[PDB]
Design brief:
Capsid protein (chain A); Nucleoplasmin-like/VP (viral coat and capsid proteins); mainly beta; host cytoplasm (chain A); 3% helix; viral protein; Elongation Factor Tu (Ef-tu), domain 3; 15 strands; Norovirus; virion (chain A); homodimer
């Protein structure tokens, strides 16, 4: 039985699995009323990728496809309809058992980034890039049907029928009108259609426990705010578990957050088979820990195991 | 001795160690006249990071720091000086034995991306939340004002005034601004990390084939362009996941050369073989330039430790 392991990486050596950001802090929020059911950064302890999760850090919240039409906004800006493929360029097959093309954003909001194009025809091809926003709550956001819309400040210089890349950067806004909610899933096929093939929701099952997140702060194009994106496991953990595919010997692994210099354990956590952490903590906010700390697998336990309080 | 291993990742599951891009193809260019001495994606087989190499995919060609002021520059656009720290926010110590802050770009060109800011000061009326702004930006790494080893660089914007002095600033790389002759794109020309007329230090060594008939093998990614004509590429010696893997494992190197086979899983056949050298680069027996045409589900498998004298089967 191949022994289960986690990579040896400090917080400062980890990246977010839900947006291309470094991990900034560990974080808890016990009183969260929302169902936590993100679709990126989802992987079982035995290496099964779930939801829209793929392996490339460059694939998270990315799109590839071709623009088909320009449609002007009523008040300001320009919108562009885009047909999307798989990130590897192959046609996206809606009959595959995934919620949407892998890498598709898994939250409601205005995602800010850059649309770039390199033409097919030519001796060297023409190029252009512009800032763009994808409103994942929009009726036009239908990646499961193979089509989305992005908007630009640029009024004209986006070409139809040419290879197009979306590189995510941050959020456009977190104002009331911008509908940012990291735990609200997009309707991958539009508002009247149910999402399908979803990674399951995650929650503590044992009183006094709460979810433990790897938190990153996400840039803003404008406005006031300090928005964050919380993932269940960093991208490096997804990559590691996928590689190893070690058999899960129970439904709950016990892990210890250790300071390697002292060798002391700072706290312990349950790492659940479905790929998420819980701790015994009754407060919200960042976990204050030495920069050299990392998680080390200790042993397999069960749902009834009582964690040492934080 | 812990056995040496490579991750099991197809080309379509790998990313570039020199720019945040997926690996598109394997690539050779035997007649390259330039000295190959890139500083990102540098790691020995036994896990020693070199040059400006760090582990985060988000750190490659990234900067963190603070804008000081707008500055004059004869070149087009609006220009800004920013101090730079280490990516983790700690002050960059120029006395450390590295060429520049880890993650600093390792090539000459106009790097296009986004500068974003989140203010330190907050407003009570806004629920004690800070103001923000972001704009497209270009960093010319060949500029005499590109001095990351001295803790300062300059960027230009199309935006004329909406960049704030003294506020935390992040550069997210996206592509290149241009590859016209006037934009000085050369992937094998190192920036002068301490400015014009200064000598770079603490460099990862140059790499080259030493066996007749062999050439370097690269992991190539195509890099986006803000405008103009071109299909520019960035070639790395090993993908970022290999850097991450070697760093983790730190397996002792049992010789100077590891024999690896590029394998296709379905057929199970070996498409070709290559030398993976101690300092962290590949060579193959090939006499042509251009892409290696093979499935993107192919991957390198470690076979055994050989030596310098080993003769590769021609590709």
């Amino acid at each position: 039985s191949k022994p289960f392991t986690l990579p040896i990486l400090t917080l400062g050596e980890l990246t977010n699995s839900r947006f291309p950001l470094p991990i900034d802090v560990l974080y808890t929020n016990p009183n969260e009323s929302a169902i936590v059911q993100c679709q990126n950064g989802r992987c079982t302890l035995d290496g099964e990728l779930q939801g829209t999760t793929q392996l490339l850090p460059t694939g998270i919240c990315a799109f590839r496809g071709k623009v088909t039409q320009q449609v002007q906004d009523e008040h300001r800006g320009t919108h562009w309809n885009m047909t999307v493929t798989n990130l590897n360029g192959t046609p996206f097959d809606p009959t595959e058992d995934v919620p949407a093309p892998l890498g598709t954003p898994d939250f409601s909001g205005q995602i800010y980034g850059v649309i770039s194009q390199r033409n097919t025809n030519t001796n060297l091809p023409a190029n252009r890039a512009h800032e763009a926003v994808i409103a994942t709550y929009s009726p036009k956001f239908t990646p499961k049907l193979g089509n989305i819309q992005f908007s630009t400040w640029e009024t004209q210089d986006v070409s139809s029928g040419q290879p197009t890349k979306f590189t995510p950067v941050g959020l456009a806004s977190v104002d009331a009108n911008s509908h940012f909610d990291q735990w609200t899933l997009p309707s991958y096929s539009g508002a009247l259609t149910l999402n399908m093939n979803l990674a399951p929701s995650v929650a503590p099952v044992f009183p006094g426990e709460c979810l433990l997140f790897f938190r990153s702060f996400i840039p803003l194009k404008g406005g006031y705010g300090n928005p964050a994106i919380d993932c269940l496991m960093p991208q490096e953990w997804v990559q590691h578990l996928y590689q190893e595919s070690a058999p899960s010997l129970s439904d709950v692994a016990l892990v210890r957050y250790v300071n390697p210099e002292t060798g002391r354990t700072l706290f312990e956590a349950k790492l659940h088979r479905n790929g998420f952490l819980t701790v015994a903590r009754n407060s919200a906010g960042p976990v204050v820990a030495p920069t050299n700390g990392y998680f080390r697998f200790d042993s397999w336990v069960n749902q009834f195991y009582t964690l040492a309080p934080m």
